[PDB]
Swiss-Prot record, chain A:
PANTHER family: RIBOSOMAL PROTEIN L30. InterPro entries: Ribosomal_eL30, Ribosomal_eL30-like, Ribosomal_eL30-like_sf, Ribosomal_eL30_CS, Ribosomal_eL8/eL30/eS12/Gad45. Belongs to the eukaryotic ribosomal protein eL30 family. GO terms for cellular component: cytosolic large ribosomal subunit. It holds the Pfam family Ribosomal_L7Ae. This is Large ribosomal subunit protein eL30. GO terms for molecular function: RNA binding; structural constituent of ribosome. Gene3D superfamilies: 3.30.1330.30. One of its GO terms (biological process) is translation. PROSITE patterns: RIBOSOMAL_L30E_1, RIBOSOMAL_L30E_2.
């Protein structure tokens, strides 16, 4: 609930890249502050994003909700298997993730 | 190479359940000898399979090829994200997996 609120806030007040393909592309280029993955993200994409994120020291938060659920959290009617926060805006998502438990 | 040949042999000469949903169903009921997962299997399904497989001591081999590729290895035109060997038939898949 807290994380989902933080994600929506980042999307509406900051800058968030939506989609697994786009997320990987941005992270590969070293851009981004935080990666959030849906619980049903394809394993290969999951490993790709974690590999590139690791290379640029970008944290990755593994969510439990589905890609369609994550899309809805972002206020979208389409699935989002992964997203990348470029700018957290007024969100506290960065801090929430830091003590993720 | 060898693994793919072994998988096709099991499908053709033995009994293999195709599909992530069916695989989980069978393993959840304690049936099966070996699970093979495609490289792009959804993470949640992957975790579910490994959880139930673990409960009935059923080995799980994580493949690198995609679901559509695995389907083709099985001689099918459709994607197969996971499969369950009920009977290896004439295949040596069990031995190969032991690695």
């Amino acid at each position: 609930m807290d994380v989902n609120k933080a994600i929506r806030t980042a999307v509406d007040t900051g800058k968030v890249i939506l989609g697994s393909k786009r997320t990987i592309k941005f992270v590969k280029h070293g851009e981004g502050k935080l990666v959030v993955l849906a619980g049903n993200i394809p394993k290969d994409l999951e490993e790709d994003v974690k590999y590139y994120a690791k290379l640029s020291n970008i944290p990755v938060y593994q969510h439990k909700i589905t890609s369609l659920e994550l899309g809805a959290v972002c206020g979208k009617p389409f699935p989002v298997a992964a997203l990348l926060v470029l700018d957290e805006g007024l969100s506290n998502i960065m801090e929430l993730v830091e003590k993720k438990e």
